[PDB]
């Protein structure tokens, strides 16, 4: 029928979040380095996992988030690093805002947005210079915070067969007085986004 820039933004963000998740896992050493292969995204160096099951898990997660992003019902996507005790040790928070009305320039939308996203990737690439090394045996999870007015979130997010979502528990989210590491913010004609890390002092 006609173009839908809400969907365009959802596609851009899902593509970018996949690359960002992969690079977070690399720079925080959540998995053995051997699975990663250096590649180029947004014209900057990145590290992509080649482990089939991990890649499908990340893609399944984002396939579920995409329709919520298309409707602008996502407030933030959070990549949480968890210790052996299931307690958050680091949180990479992607705060996502789509303006209620867009004013779109005519000269190369995606190219401009992709240049802005490359800065996020570069920041993630060097965030280990200010974060303390995580304890051994950490895992990760993804948290989706929806807008208060969002309706039927639990049904809308169940896109993938055999990949159910559940409400997180207090233990899944809470950190006591974490350090704040601002990484990057951007404003474009179609989306505003901020990325920062919350690090457990421990």
């Amino acid at each position: 029928q006609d173009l839908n820039f809400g969907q365009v933004v959802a596609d851009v963000l899902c593509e970018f979040l996949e690359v960002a998740v992969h690079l977070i896992l690399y720079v925080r050493e959540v998995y053995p380095v051997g699975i990663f292969q250096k590649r180029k995204k947004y014209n900057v160096p990145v590290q992509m996992s080649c482990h089939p099951e991990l890649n499908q898990y990340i893609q399944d997660t984002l396939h579920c988030v995409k329709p919520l992003l298309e409707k602008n019902d996502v407030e933030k996507v959070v990549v949480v690093i968890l210790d052996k005790e299931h307690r958050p040790v680091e949180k990479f928070v992607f705060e996502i805002t789509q303006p209620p009305l867009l004013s779109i320039s005519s000269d190369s939308l995606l190219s401009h947005v992709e240049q802005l996203l490359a800065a996020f990737i570069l920041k993630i690439s060097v965030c280990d210079a200010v974060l303390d090394h995580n304890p051994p045996g950490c895992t990760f999870t993804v948290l989706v915070h929806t807008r208060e007015a969002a309706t039927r979130n639990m049904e809308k997010i169940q896109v993938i067969k055999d990949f159910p979502w559940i409400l997180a528990d207090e233990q899944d989210v809470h950190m006591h007085d974490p350090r704040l590491i601002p990484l990057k913010t951007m404003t474009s004609d179609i989306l505003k986004m901020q990325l920062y890390v919350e690090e457990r002092a421990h």
């Binding site: 292969q37 991990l54 999870t141 989706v144 929806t146 979502w165 997180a168 899944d172």
Partner: peptide, 27 residues
């Protein structure tokens, strides 16, 4: 208030499985 999360956990990747990935699935 509380966010949503996947019920399933991501896979565990042993040091050995990583060598297999590096051997066959990289360029």
């Amino acid at each position: 208030k509380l966010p949503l999360r996947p019920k399933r956990s991501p896979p565990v990747i042993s040091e050995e499985a990583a060598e297999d990935v590096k051997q066959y699935l990289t360029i």
